[PDB]
Design a protein around this ligand. Structure first.
Ligand SMILES: [Mn+2]
Ligand SMILES: [Mn+2]
Ligand SMILES: [Mn+2]
Lengths: 203, 203
């Protein structure tokens, strides 16, 4: 018998659970045997981003299954973290000083990095392929109102708030109801959902 | 402040911005150490740790953040032979063959044994690449040039492309990789991507 070499990662045993329009036994979702964690469209996740030397957060948008060999591809909408926001572009849209006054740019860079909610994410329609071996934890993303309520009890590594969707460049913000984006993502087809989201920030 | 470096920092990739011709607008990346130059249209061999082997892409956009010089390298994903759907491929190029013998296995074995392992298949699916995973510039040519270079190919640098297809390795449409290359560095990134994407869709 061919004894296949394994790695610790193989102990987790991510399982592909397929279901029908509502029940079980099509729509797929991933379940980790070791702890029961389940991932599917609409779920936001904290992933290790080695290129950034820190974590990145995404909203799973598609579990692509290759029926010929069970190879799975996890695709997700990319959120931007505070340091990916274009401060000036942001203030020109929400701070009258940016358009009325002529303050030096550094003024807005310092102001943003000093006042921005570091746990406020910005949804973008830009898809990225994720690898399960980089999974950190399920993210708890909520809108501004819930955030106000939870403010005093936030787990800075799991809880985040989203009020806008914007271009990957961190500009052109559009108010959104993240909870509804989530419901919408797991309801309509992948390409249709992403395209709708992509058009929200362009004329 | 003494900044901590890694060997990667010795390569020093440089950002070069030029007009629609040259000078000091479009961007290119140049590695100071060996002079390697990368820009839209260029196909590249990258290490793919998720795949445990290399992957090939065609750079489609060099995104620059002029606020901090952080660059994002986006590229069209090529599929390698082992990512093609044997059935669909067989079924599309040889077929009008009323039958299918021992499906999966006969097709997987047949394709892998008759396919040009150095034939890539373009897809309009974008992926963000990291320079620290760059291996070498790929030499992707059309079918005619490949026959000429046939007996003198470098297995890890020389590739031939004749089709664009869906990321799932099906629905192959004839394309001229050289023409795609000229087109990519000529029109807007999104415009180019969207065009390539529709090439395999009903319309
Ligand atoms: Mn980005
Ligand atoms: Mn790695
Ligand atoms: Mn793929």
């Amino acid at each position: 018998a061919m004894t296949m070499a394994k790695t610790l990662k193989d102990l987790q045993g991510w399982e592909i659970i397929t279901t029908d329009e509502q029940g079980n036994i099509t729509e797929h979702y991933l379940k980790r045997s070791s702890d029961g964690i389940k991932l599917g469209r609409g779920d936001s996740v904290v992933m290790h981003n080695e290129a950034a030397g820190t974590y990145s957060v995404y909203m799973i948008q598609e579990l692509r299954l290759n029926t010929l060999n069970n190879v799975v591809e996890l695709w997700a909408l990319t959120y931007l973290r505070w340091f990916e926001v274009n401060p000036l572009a942001h203030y020109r849209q929400f701070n009258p000083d940016a358009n009325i006054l002529n303050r030096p740019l550094n003024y807005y860079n310092k102001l943003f990095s000093e006042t921005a909610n570091k746990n406020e994410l910005y949804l973008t329609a830009e898809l990225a392929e994720l690898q399960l071996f980089n999974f950190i934890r399920v993210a708890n993303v909520m809108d501004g109102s819930k955030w106000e309520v939870l403010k005093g009890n936030v787990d800075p590594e799991r809880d985040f708030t989203v009020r806008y969707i914007c271009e990957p460049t961190g500009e052109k913000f559009v108010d959104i109801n993240i909870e509804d984006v989530k419901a919408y993502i797991k309801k309509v087809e992948p390409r249709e959902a992403q395209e709708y989201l992509k058009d929200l920030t362009l004329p």
